[PDB]
Symmetry: D2
Subunit: 397 residues, 4 copies
Amino acid sequence: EIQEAYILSGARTPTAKFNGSFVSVSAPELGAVAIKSAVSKSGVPVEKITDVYMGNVLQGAVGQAPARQASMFAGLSPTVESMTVNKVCASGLKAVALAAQNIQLGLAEAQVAGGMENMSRVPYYLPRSTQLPPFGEIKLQDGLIQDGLWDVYNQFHMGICAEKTAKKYEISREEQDQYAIQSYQRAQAAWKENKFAEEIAPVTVKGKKGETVVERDEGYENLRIDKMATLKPAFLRDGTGTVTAGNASTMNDGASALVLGSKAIAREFAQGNRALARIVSTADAAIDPVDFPVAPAKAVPIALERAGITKDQVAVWEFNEAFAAVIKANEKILGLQNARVNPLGGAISLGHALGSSGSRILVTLLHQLQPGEYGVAAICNGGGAATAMVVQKLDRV
Amino acid sequence: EIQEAYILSGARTPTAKFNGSFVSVSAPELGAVAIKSAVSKSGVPVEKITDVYMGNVLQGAVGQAPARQASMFAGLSPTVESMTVNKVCASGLKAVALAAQNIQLGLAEAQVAGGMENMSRVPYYLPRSTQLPPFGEIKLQDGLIQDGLWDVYNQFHMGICAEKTAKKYEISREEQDQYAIQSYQRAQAAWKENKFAEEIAPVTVKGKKGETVVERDEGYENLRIDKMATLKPAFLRDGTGTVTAGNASTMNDGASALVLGSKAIAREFAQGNRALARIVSTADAAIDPVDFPVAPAKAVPIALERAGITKDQVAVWEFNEAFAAVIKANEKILGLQNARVNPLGGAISLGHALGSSGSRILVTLLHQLQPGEYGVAAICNGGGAATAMVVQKLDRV
Amino acid sequence: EIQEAYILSGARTPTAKFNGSFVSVSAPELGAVAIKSAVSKSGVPVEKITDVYMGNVLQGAVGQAPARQASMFAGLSPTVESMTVNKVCASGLKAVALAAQNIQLGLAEAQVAGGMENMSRVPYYLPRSTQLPPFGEIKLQDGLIQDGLWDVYNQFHMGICAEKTAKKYEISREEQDQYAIQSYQRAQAAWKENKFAEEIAPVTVKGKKGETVVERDEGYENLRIDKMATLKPAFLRDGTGTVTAGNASTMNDGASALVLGSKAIAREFAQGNRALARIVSTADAAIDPVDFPVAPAKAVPIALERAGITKDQVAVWEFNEAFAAVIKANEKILGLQNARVNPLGGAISLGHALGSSGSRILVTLLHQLQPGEYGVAAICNGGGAATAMVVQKLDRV
Amino acid sequence: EIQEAYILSGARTPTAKFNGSFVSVSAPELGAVAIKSAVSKSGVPVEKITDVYMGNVLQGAVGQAPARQASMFAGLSPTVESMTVNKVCASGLKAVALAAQNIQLGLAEAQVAGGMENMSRVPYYLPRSTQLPPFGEIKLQDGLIQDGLWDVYNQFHMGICAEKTAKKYEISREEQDQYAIQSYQRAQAAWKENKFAEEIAPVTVKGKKGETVVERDEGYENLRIDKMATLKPAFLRDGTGTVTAGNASTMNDGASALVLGSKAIAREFAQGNRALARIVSTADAAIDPVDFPVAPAKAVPIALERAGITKDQVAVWEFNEAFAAVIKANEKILGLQNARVNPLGGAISLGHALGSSGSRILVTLLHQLQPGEYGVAAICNGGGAATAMVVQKLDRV
């Protein structure tokens, strides 16, 4: 009596630059535009949707119950339950898996899930009087670094963890800069062909002078293939530095949302749906924190097993491009050198709104699968962990 | 083939006052102490536990992946997966349901779940350069208020939500103070008889020169019956105010954790476990944000329906005492005036560490049920929601 | 045996915009530039100069002993004594008076004196732990407001003081806005003909890529004659308001410095010096804090009396344009609507670096005086006071 | 033509501990209390007093025109002119020398002058948006440290300057501790005989429980002769260090004020005055910033020559006890190791309100001279400078 869960629809905001277009738009406002567009496209009447689960990594100053904000700003009923989920970078995918579980268990027939992040709006932390010294210099941490990008156990940046997977699998500066230039080109190629028009939910940002409609990603046109090899290593300055701002993910503001359904709900409302797919399997996996870059290589086989398919049976892989080194290490271990991996670009060129990325790569995946094809979305997360989902694209049922 | 999920064991830190015994101990350090104790008391080999789900509502400056830190500081393997959950005050119960689902779907045989909050260590928020005015006065938000206790939709304290439920259900200042007084007395009674010794995991605070072992809830000895009628309203000062510091929960630091298992794991390892129980059902439910106080009245029936039991079959009820007004309104609507609700005290007297409280009431519940008895934990949460769990205490499986 | 004191030099930095070209350049580093130039142009060997007195009304985060910093950055010997003076907006004129007094008493034969402010660099104030509340919202004062522009006794902006001087002496919105347009045109006319080239000392700003040389006042171009009449009252928002951002002075970053000498030093080194003049008198005067705008009307008569001259003998008046309402009020009381007041514009168009403006309007006066002419510099200051100096331009002796 | 100036009265507040009795009382309120007393003991009719000059080193968040605030809170007329003077630690004595100059030129007949500092109330500095990085950790400077106690040129504490002076003049840990023990003992002797009753103006602190009258210095009782030789160096902690919290100035809150008069005003109203004295000479001197400790040794001879007296004609020396090492070094250079130096204690035991201390030592010096005796107040200040005043105590004329 374990049931099956279907993706009926998917939408994402454009991915804006750090301190760019979405500075005045909170993560839940971004969530709201992704959820409004997902429910519209699902063909499901809003009253069947009973829960909104949204990933959000940096919750500081977002106000009470971020997920609940997104739900309410999307115009959903106050009767719809909600939850903000933090599996760091995996938050968005994990949220989709949690919503699927509600359907798999018979507890609900329709769900919305995804993620959201406004990195521009994460704040600095001032401790209260009892945790301040009585005199002398105070250091205030940036939430982006202390909560987002700093390993607790080995007290260094995620960038250093990548440096140590880059050496252990012999992934050079040149190999990394090659993958990054290719991510930028695939993104430019996909935008010229307009491959993101149907998944994208435009954000109307207000203001004093204007009203601007943002409908295009920000940062994918910034490729200077000249400069890329001329960049300093951003994290390791002991001579052996290979990760740079060029060949790593950028910080971004953005959101993404999907509507999920039972077999019954998919049949009645979703048969022609463009993003219609079965959730075949999900899997989480963890190893040592420093080794978070290769966690996906642990999660993917568990997911493939639970789906009873081989690697060769998945048409498209979407792995989140945290760092070029991450993709190349994971390509090596799973033997995916000639697989379709991030064909339209990834987080190096399209951006990384942390809480959203897990569900944004799923939205991108579903739009580039043919009927009957298996897809895989996998994303690594800080602390040494990863979430992978197997999806089968469908025309009906 | 939906499997059954069993609580094998349960522990909680003491609940320390705001700016007290735990200012130096981060929420995940507190988490690790409750987890260490729960796994130890479970009798399950540590390698069979595959996931740690911790509730935590105010994640600011806790550092990356708060639940991951709790799991590692507990000595659990880096192979153990984690996720930190934010359903505001319901976070800790929701985390237990989420872990139960892993077992129900056959994805794991043993879990740890619970919650943690250090309200002392919640920072103030300073926005970055791009959100600050060029000149003129700046307001820094506390963070306890902006993220914890401030409604986004009606821009006012959770306390005003309590005031409106107090008027609507004609719950008097005197009725509130009388419940508050009873909460204090029940907590003093319980501490005199040492009724919390089994469930409490002492915390070792490495102080200035020496080291203090905390094993006693702080706050429950602070009843001044005489002064109770003359306390100022904390939130509403128009003459109609009824909710005070006296009849409201306090801010607190603490953590709580349980070990869950499959039938196979309980049989082989937990026969006769002191806190052994079946998770018979769970329910989430939501209504208008201002009516969050009464959301538990909507969830409890759904959870009783899914257990196939009636109110009268519930031996004891653990409802979170967010405000006296909350417990009285729920007692009215569900007709539980003559049922055993919060027999040993609650949040008014024993404290409210937001992210922990949902799992803290479950731990307290399990230690006061006889073999074969049914119990309900229920907890309201900001944005207008609640979750309720039905448990059946057991000698063996 | 009271000796006379003469002015031999006279320099000022360009007045940069708030958050303009000098954000990187500390008020002392600005002072040093204006000092280096004024000692160079004096002809006096640097070893004869024994003291540096500099105005600076906003000293927060400037570092130890601002005036000292100015002196040392200016290359002057550690043997030179310094003091930083705060008479709010009079600070710069006051420091010249006090340096003159050293010469008037026979304690020294050569002094540098003047003023400096970097309002861009004025900080916000965070109370230490003993003056912070244990929880809830904190207000951080700007300091441009709290220390700079806020009357202590009547808790309102210097702007409100001006409003009450604008009503009392019936000075209308249109009368203010006329004077402002007039000021803006006199500054353009002056810069077109390049009149400030002699008095300005260019500031080389060291940047991340190259070096910029700033030689031009920033803000005198910004006249939109039409928009002036539609600008909202800045300070008084009950309908009756007349004072605007446009008809008021701006916040600015700049410095000014003069070299003073004994008769003996003037004769031996400074005959036919461009700036050469005798300080014939000074006077300070104070009234009610709200009436600080009309305080130059109490100080100029006293200063004339001590000079032993009549109003109609003074060639050029330089009153600081703190507001348009100020200049007009003082034109009505002294009967100067028929005299040369601020011929080359003032603080409305040329800016207002608080601590510098006193000595700035002095340098600007000395450069537009012909031999044997009497000039008066006068400057109102917050708390209800003013400082007036009478000079006599000289070719020799 | 140059007159001479008379001290007619002298008052100070008790010197309160850092974060002690005056936390809630702003520097200008403390100045007001000291001014009220000095005016009241002057037996000058208030309206003859035309100017208030007060030292204040740390003006941040004190509000506009600190000296004006002291004047107005004292009850003096808005008629009265004011100025706040910043010569670091020499501020209060320089203020007295400036006010005298007004009398010595014939510009006034009666002046108030002194200093004030609330080091408890000095704030931390948050730069505005334009001087903050776009992301990453921020350091907030205390303000006591950055403006008060940090050398700009060398980038180290005023305590490191003392450590250099200590080693250059072979002043050992034991020698420094002996002077500090002696300072505490002399201060205890002076308090047991009530030798400060005449000069101390008690401060009334309004609380949220009642009123407190503070009449006694805080800190002079804290001597533990045992624990003094066991204290860790405070500023040089590499093992080389000699200066401790014990043998250095404390941080303190306090204020001090004298009334000054013409020969004509002394005669008509101050014959008999307890504190009555002539200002014989005043001198400022400057050397290398690291050498500030020894700047008094350069300033004293200049002040003596201008007084036309020799060292031996001085009954009592008050040198501000910034560091025990500062006193012992100047004693060596000037050959005053056997002279009457700080007989009733100093800043090491009696505290050190920066802006106040220069005039505080002057009022202490006046109350221990006999008629016809010469006294010297000398005080080193940050940036490598000092101010010395020579007075002659007088019973009349």
